[PDB]
Design brief:
CATH superfamily of chain A: PAS domain
Strand content of chain A: 25-35%
Subunit structure (chains A, B): Monomer.
Domain PAS (chains A, B): 23-86
Distance between the termini of chain A: 20 Å
Largest sheet of chain A: 5 strands, antiparallel
Number of helices of chain A: 6
Number of strands of chain A: 5
Oligomer: homodimer
CATH class of chain A: Alpha Beta
Bound molecules: 4'-hydroxycinnamic acid
Organism (chains A, B): Halorhodospira halophila (Ectothiorhodospira halophila)
Shape of chain A: globular
Pfam family, one (chains A, B): PAS
Radius of gyration of chain A: 13 Å
Family (chains A, B): Belongs to the photoactive yellow protein family.
Helix content of chain A: 25-40%
């Protein structure tokens, strides 16, 4: 495992150094999106929570294709505000329920250090 | 019962001699984790507090699987700091609320004497 806690204040600095395998070592789900919501990275812990295969979702659009239940003011709306403002750091609970048993999670979206990159972190609640 | 008090200054020396049955005799919950948070030992008193079955949780990851509510800077963050520094001795109250009635506890994490081992002690408050 990689010793990083969900919600940590410097998470964007710690995860900037991680390859695919290190991201797969986290205690929580980690998704990286571009500013349009296309999936750039997606770790194994996320697949443990939602059942998706981390290899197959890369390149798909999170809001349009993978996670339409997040296409709402309360999730996508917050994401796109943060993208437009160039700052994003918001945490909230949510339920993931598309083609799956409804699963309540805590979500933390935070702008990455890489250009045009935004993290979506997920854990069970 | 085993005559050891929660928070005692030499608890790591006293619990080094205990088998499963002696650990099960303590007045408080006692979990032993490796440095990644995988569960090595887990006593009966802990199961009385949180409802989990001590045999089934051995080998699971505390922060990723069993106790996601502890995957936070205030619990896991402190744990991993103590692991990285090779010293850990911290006590704090916390609420355990994953798939259970929220239960307020006092937590004491302390490095064990065994290599790559860390105690998490729990009592109700
Ligand atoms: C709602 O449609 C949520 C879908 C979802 C969220 C997170 C994932 O890893 C996969 C699908
Ligand atoms: C939060 O998710 C806490 C969970 C928990 C703590 C302690 C246990 O013995 C079992 C589950």
């Amino acid at each position: 495992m990689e010793h990083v806690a969900f919600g940590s204040e410097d998470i964007e600095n710690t995860l900037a150094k991680m390859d695919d395998g290190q991201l797969d070592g986290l205690a929580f789900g980690a998704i990286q999106l571009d500013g349009d919501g296309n999936i750039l990275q997606y770790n194994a812990a996320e697949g443990d929570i939602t059942g998706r295969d981390p290899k197959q979702v890369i390149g798909k659009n999170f809001f349009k294709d993978v996670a339409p239940c997040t296409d709402s003011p309360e999730f996508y709306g917050k994401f796109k505000e943060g993208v437009a403002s160039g700052n994003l750091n918001t945490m909230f609970e949510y339920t993931f329920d598309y083609q799956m048993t409804p699963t309540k999670v805590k979500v933390h979206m935070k702008k990455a250090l890489s250009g045009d990159s935004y993290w979506v972190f997920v854990k069970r609640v």
